Design a protein around this ligand. Structure first.
Ligand code: NAD
Ligand code: NAD
Ligand code: 6OH
Ligand code: 6OH
Ligand code: NA
Ligand code: NA
Ligand code: NA
Lengths: 483, 483, 483, 484
């Protein structure tokens, strides 16, 4: 099985390839042609040229219709996409069928719709001579959008950037994660089959440093680099595009907290924190790795969660009742297990998990770990401050509202937070004081694609979603007419 | 005369001072205390702490009333502010009385008003359990805003940043240009006398590299760096805040064109290009330095502009019919005369100017140059592509509409453009195809503070003005309530 | 051959029927069942109850999907709808295929899209106790919308009300014009086949006074009456719903002007005024019946228009080069002919037309009149001030700009106006001074569904289109939470 | 004593007929008020039309905003004079006038002047067949002459609530305040004059409704809009009256508002809140609760608690120490309210407290006071539970189920406002969104942000005002489409 680049309307190989490994069993699923500097350039130039082609001449209605045909094209091959995401990542088949693929289809449809309904502004003004003037704004394509995406929700996060870039009439050069290159390749087939003009969408495979990713960010032909990944990678990219003063949008790491107040519906909160800690084996940026529970309910909470966690089925993506699959890679398991050990050395009490499960089959050749819960660590422990990106949470008691607010906020990260309380005043009062981009109250990972989405501090720069995407992926130009 | 820093409600001196020179006659105006890294730290920490004080507890209405009070304080000392801008820069007194100071006052009033009238968004959504969810957004202070500003319109551009920063409830550490520190210092006095709480507004004097400016961009305590200056400086600052992923807003250089079509009102166009090329002695980022005139009117346009340029009075700020003062500094003049030499070397015809005026009085010790017009250079000439920031324009003929649009856009910059035509379709057809942030038709430098403002390519990153400022200087936070 | 009412999911007949006549040849097309008062009540009650059924429980996304299905259902029977519109009205087949039916479909698609993308507002406020309060708004269904539509663009205008009513979650009782009932009836079939729940859409046929129309306006069960028709009918309806304080939205009559300045593209303006005066045989509310032409081009304009009018092909809807069909009915023809005679009695020169064409075939049994052009009437002539709604225009010369603006605005109507000029300043300067809801410059009948649309003075009440429709067809509720 | 004149075309003028202004505290004559006739209303409208073509029409948005801030400044500069005028007319407690009435009226002008400065309009690009495209842009122009007709419950607040956005949008105004409260509007005319507002821009006409200035105004072909606040019946009458001219209309009408106290409410706070919402301005605000529903489990405790607080209410002089309630607006209004007091007894209400008039043994016995009143035991169908009384009264009823009480609140021909008391997050949002009214408060009452849309549903109104909705209503929204 092979995954090729898609450049100027053609699938092409490269002088080098790398292995794509199924993390369920460590088996080789495909070879992936790594694009080189020359190929990246060819992609960017083709995207620049595609801006003056038929793509640039499409009305907003016609463009939106073609974007819906991309969406239709994915729906037509729905189960192939599901198989592709599962293979790369080992995620449960039910998760891919209900979350990953549907949300990616929704990204195209929503931004196609937004593009059709969006408008701009008119400002009337007085002048010295009494005749006045008119200022109006227009949205134009920004140009070539470089897209660099992670492996946690591969197609979803890929299409989260590609859909509005295309909806705004831009062209795209996109580099998916080396760990999850398959669904992105299928998408390039859908684009091609949908008749998306050559050069409008370009897919380059490869790595970051000294590979396609780096090359893309250094290429002077792009107009913007939108990125989702590690905070340190974002800082690196920001330096790379600095001489070109490229527009940037970064969605970076988090060490997200959940907070359970004494008046929470305890069962729902336990359920809630279970989902937020262990979904996708805790490999979601929005996962809660720190949890604060009111002292009066702390023991009862940790008990209930231990039970639920131990009922979780860790196995095959298609196994009956499965809840967790493997981590994305062996290298990633190494770093995660390394934190498991670091936690012990730091004084943690291992409430559950803290190692790898035993299968006595091919899965032992995979990259599984157990859902883990810690207690007993201090606020300054590395395991409570640094992002692990595994199925783990530490639970800590608290006593006062203002105290826990301060403790949640005592982070260099600021992506998201979940609060559990049944009290009206408390919900709104506490929520507004959490220094993050997204707060959920009595739920987790509910996403409305119209809302602004982003993080504060090291967790990012800018907002995307709804009008914020329509703004970022466009040139906003002001035209002033003297009358 | 001495200009002090203003840190945490106190005017403070520093270990070193530097010279503020009057560009009219080369004489010493004042000594300015240069903030060291320790003082910059002190300012940032005070700014952080002020967010937690009385300032942080003001209602939006009370915060707006206080900002209007700052404006009233400037107005109450209007002529002192006029005297200060004039002294630092040599700008004509009438310009300072009609443009610089009144627009600085308007910055505060406009953003105080916007702060009172702004609101956010409500999104309703359905959920699988049929109960639904509410998503609402809020605007919070981003935190401590670092402001670094240029010398071309000192108080105007300085308050362009500080006014929305404060209006959004942020605290500020601001570093004005070393060439123009005086009006900023008066502003600090207005702040103090208006009762702005200690730490909310902090003024640090100094240079950029290895000085106050650099130290500000490096301090981990800021949340954003908003900047107006050279494109190369912007790139440096982008790199400098990259590790901390600070929000950034950049308004950078330009090589702005004016286009004069055959159907222009010729005399209005001549007058318009005269203003756009020579206002503030060509030292405004929005100035035209490239001009394209239709072949049929080229000779007549050049002859007309030569006459008007030679009528310009270059002299004292309060001299009777004065139009132009000097350049900001001897150092800047050295750079400008170097470009004058380069133009001749590149084969230009000097239609007028090209040197320095001889006054035979104290002004000869100052930094004056002549308004200058070139013809005959190619589009590839350095003098036609690089920003000079002096009172100069090159004029070139054109034949065809699409041709001239391409020539305008063939630039690494894209700040502004001015177009002269009496034709309804032409005005709208052409302006939308110019790759810049701002197009004027039949005027120049009309600014409505509600409009988005900024540049493309090397001319900047992001937009400010109106709701764009209200969004940039705020944390936009999303709160999601499961019902 | 028989057109039934559609009430609570069932096609039902009535106690009496009336004749639907083909205006091409006077032949009977169908019998139409006239809804009585009890059936109108039945419709309103069924609509009230459907608010509480499954329709009320759809998410906005599901509701929007269903409205797209309705659009898809029209598209699937495209030619059937074309045949229906043509049969009732005699409009050229090409017009129905290109204007009428596609725009009816677009109505549904556009408001479905707007429903998905619309959101509401969040207001934060301070309170004495320092904890604050949150105000947010929501859009809810207004209730049962009563829709009463005219015969000029039957399906287009019908769906212009029905689409946003359904898009906003309302239920509907709609009464199309007795002159054009066929396409509305076909629409009811499409609703049925698409599975729109019973009672959500209800179609009642009949007349105005003492018939289905009046009864609908008097029913206390509706929440709003949206109407398009003559101004006097609007007044009648305003009184009828007064006791109920029903929400109202009126698009009434006009006497629209076209103005041609000396610098207009003469050929384009002649072509434009030809379309604006004679499209749909002058039976569009937006048609020009008053034309003002600058004196220097008056004779040339009139001579050119006469030539183009006499080239117009008046005939069968499927006659190969047909431009115009008949008027809507013999009764309407008699009214128009009465004005044709009044014009002559008022002193008009008949430049062309002024009577009925002789076909020497079945068309002579239809309701055709000639495209007519008048000159020589004063601004006080009844034929110059009262809406005729036939294929007619008076042409008058003018000399001054403020003069012609005055004569344009000197009217009790204010629907629309078209101005022809190539001058940038004049276009914007004059347009803003015309007291109408809509000005076109160098075109006519360009409609963007996002824009506000309506009249001033006798031409209407309120605005529809874009968010104005989303607001009118919705309850806007404010919810204020003390924290 | 005092005299109140009309203000037409920059001049204070008298009339052929006058009527009396009566202090409701003691029944004493305050002033004579000149009733404008048909001729004078016409003179006002025509002056307002001409004013649109004068210097007023030529001001920039910024200069017009500055002038409106000058009007607010003028009211502030005469603050205590305005307080005295609202109080004299209405008998409202001086503290209410000083903290609610007068400051809000000043805030009305300031808010809409600011909105005027910040507001902008829309740009729509579109594709065309020939591929050159087109641009649609919208502008806001003044609508024209706005007729304003206001009520007596919050005289200057509600008057300026219409007059401020009208002027902010560049309209001219002919305004007719309630015959029951003509004073503060007359003082506003003085402020306008002194502030240099051009003649014809603001015109003040005094009188009644039917066969007087109010009716004449609604009938004049010269106005562009009629904005109105008052009884629902009057709303309908006026809607018929402007129908022939198809005038723009905005109506804020009657209500029979409910308060709901759920079992998880902060009980003491709910008692306090319902006390305020039922008896503030002696129950004479359109936003007052007159129907109350309390969960069965806390019903008795709630009622006994409210009884205690209602009986500690001080009824008396507007400047009396700790006064909570002044008199009703007039003896005529009291007749109406007492009639409902009787009706409640006849329908079988238990009178928990009040139900009569207090005995003062001084001049206040010549005024129009009644007692704060609480009823129980009436059915949802009782007239006193369904008809707007507009006095200091509430009926309290128990309920058991959430959906039940939601249906009971909504079972009304009115739909102005509702207040909900609960400490539950889910409940506040779930229940609020189901209440068929324009405004719901949770755990409070009568908080107003001037930026929010405001209006009623069903008989309680037509349209919305506030923020962008006032900017839209008081403006011509015109679309200009340019083929490129
Ligand atoms: N803020 C969000 O919304 C969000 C969403 C999903 C994931 N994330 C985060 O992403 C991370 C997930 O792991 P990850 O390994 O995919 O992140 P990563 O930074 O290691 O790499 C992500 C992408 O960037 C590329 N890349 C790496 N180095 C590069 C370089 N020097 N130049 C250019 N491109 C380079 C990679 O090839 C990959 O495509 C976590 O930190 C997680 O929190 C954030
Ligand atoms: N402003 C606009 O956008 C617009 C658009 C299209 C047509 N129009 C106008 O419509 C008029 C032509 O159409 P028309 O002849 O069908 O108008 P019309 O007023 O005679 O009738 C229109 C509709 O109203 C119904 N109706 C008539 N009397 C009624 C009553 N007393 N109570 C309730 N309903 C009643 C009719 O049955 C019909 O359905 C022209 O004035 C034209 O300009 C205006
Ligand atoms: O509405 C009256 C005529 C305008 C035609 C349209 O396209 C429309 O109504 O949307
Ligand atoms: O408007 C009705 C009652 C008063 C509420 C307000 O404060 C207002 O209308 O602005
Ligand atoms: Na200097
Ligand atoms: Na017919
Ligand atoms: Na009185």
């Amino acid at each position: 099985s092979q995954l090729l680049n898609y450049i100027d309307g053609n699938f092409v190989t490269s002088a080098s390839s790398f292995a794509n490994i199924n993390p369920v069993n460590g088996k080789l699923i495909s070879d992936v042609f790594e694009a080189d500097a020359k190929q990246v350039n060819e992609a960017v130039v083709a995207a620049q040229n595609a801006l003056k082609g038929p793509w640039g001449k499409l009305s907003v209605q016609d463009r939106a219709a073609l974007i819906h045909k991309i969406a239709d094209g994915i729906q037509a091959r729905f189960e192939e996409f599901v198989a592709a995401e599962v293979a790369d990542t080992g995620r449960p088949v039910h998760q891919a069928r209900t979350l990953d693929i549907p949300r990616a289809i929704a990204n195209f449809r929503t931004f196609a719709d937004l593009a059709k309904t969006s408008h701009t502004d008119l400002f009337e003004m007085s002048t010295s001579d009494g005749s006045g003037a008119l200022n109006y704004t227009v949205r134009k394509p920004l140009g070539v959008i470089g897209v660099i995406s992670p492996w946690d929700l591969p197609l979803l996060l890929f299409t989260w950037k590609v859909a509005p870039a295309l909806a705004c009439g831009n062209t795209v050069v996109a580099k998916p994660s080396e760990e999850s290159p398959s669904s992105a390749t299928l998408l390039a087939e859908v684009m091609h089959d949908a008749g998306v003009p050559p050069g409008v969408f370009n897919l380059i495979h490869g790595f970051g440093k000294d590979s396609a990713g780096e090359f893309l960010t250094q290429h002077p032909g792009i107009s913007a680099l939108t990125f989702t990944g590690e905070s340190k990678t974002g800082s690196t990219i920001m330096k790379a595009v600095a001489d070109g003063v490229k527009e940037v949008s970064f969605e970076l790491g988090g060490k997200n907290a959940a907070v359970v107040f004494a008046d929470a519906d305890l069962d729902a909160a336990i359920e809630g924190v279970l989902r937020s800690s262990f979904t996708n084996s805790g490999q979601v940026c929005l996962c809660s790795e720190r949890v604060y529970v009111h002292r009066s309910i702390f023991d009862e909470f940790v008990s209930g969660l231990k039970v639920e966690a131990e009922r979780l089925v860790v196995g095959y993506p298609d196994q009956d009742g499965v809840n967790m699959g493997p981590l994305i890679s062996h290298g990633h398991r190494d770093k995660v297990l390394s934190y498991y050990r670091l936690a012990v050395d730091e004084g943690a009490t291992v409430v559950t998990g803290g190692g790898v499960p035993k299968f006595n089959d091919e899965r032992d050749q995979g990259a599984y770990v157990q859902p883990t819960i810690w207690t007993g660590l201090s606020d300054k422990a590395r395991c409570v401050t640094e992002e692990i990106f595994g199925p783990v949470c530490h639970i800590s008691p608290f006593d006062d509202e203002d105290e826990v607010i301060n403790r949640v906020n005592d982070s260099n990260y600021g992506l998201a937070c979940a609060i559990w309380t049944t009290n009206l005043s408390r919900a709104h009062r506490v929520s507004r004081q959490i220094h993050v981009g997204l707060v959920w109250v009595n739920t987790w990972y509910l996403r409305d694609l119209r809302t602004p989405f982003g993080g504060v501090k090291l967790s990012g720069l800018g907002r995307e979603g709804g009008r914020f995407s329509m703004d970022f992926y466009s040139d906003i130009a002001n035209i002033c007419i003297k009358i």
